[PDB]
Design a binder for this molecule. Sequence first.
Ligand SMILES: *[C@@H]1O[C@H](CO)[C@@H](O)[C@H](O)[C@H]1NC(C)=O
Length: 319
Amino acid sequence: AGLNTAAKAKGLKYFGSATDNPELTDSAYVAQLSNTDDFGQITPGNSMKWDATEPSQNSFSFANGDAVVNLANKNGQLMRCHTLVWHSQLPNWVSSGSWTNATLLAAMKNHITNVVTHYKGKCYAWDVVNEALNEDGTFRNSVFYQIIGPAYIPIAFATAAAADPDVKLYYNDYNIEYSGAKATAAQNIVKMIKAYGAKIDGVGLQAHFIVGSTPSQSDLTTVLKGYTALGVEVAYTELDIKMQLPSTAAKLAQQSTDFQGVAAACVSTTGCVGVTIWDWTDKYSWVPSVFQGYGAPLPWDENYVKKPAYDGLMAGLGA
Ligand SMILES: *[C@@H]1O[C@H](CO)[C@@H](O)[C@H](O)[C@H]1NC(C)=O
């Protein structure tokens, strides 16, 4: 019994975790990441992004991504590959470049084709385009939007599908898990890609939530079904629930309830294929400076010891 076994019993394809290459020298860490009772799927937190894979123009660098795939392969875990086109973690040669539509499309397509071809057959899913929207539902004024216009999004999907016709292609974003202008805009991006005639198989809902401010199971489920209704599968792709510090028993209990609701929403939704937590131990959680004051976001603590949230996830998965 563990998260992945429970998830699969309920019909999900996996419960899984992200990781990153600096953690892999920690053999105790790796032993639990490799426990397929809890994790049937791995995401590389950083080593398949554009800054990692094409840090200078045309210079593809796959060793760190390959090391994560090799670990997953050894363990019999699925991969989700993350992420091709994104405004963040973009090398300066792209973000600062002097582009025309043709020249940026060439470089963007070259990035996709090379990365996706290299990983052909190794990935369950690709996050093809990440965080294309602002909070108010406008397009982000990234280099792609400013130079190419909205077509960059369906072109990226079409390019990925040409390189690897069978991997599931996802649009991934945060703050699209509750209703609002941003979730509506994410729906409209799905419709727009499909109308262009490009393949989109999934919406990735990052699920970076806050303890005590997490959307209810009911709200989350409703929003998932708003996506599945458009003809895509859905997954929670980067789940973590940071709490306002310091940690307390009451907050740990609330955090358990919050995680429980997310797992239950997925299990309740036909077409929700799985949940990936954004790493699994607080020691390696993602808490950048903009969230100073928050922390302890994950189901195991910094000592690799389960927190109440682990039991909350199990309950939410019906175990
Ligand atoms: C860039 O080229 C694509 C592909 O033909 C097209 O859909 C889009 O409108 C173009 N954008 C600009 C700004 O010329």
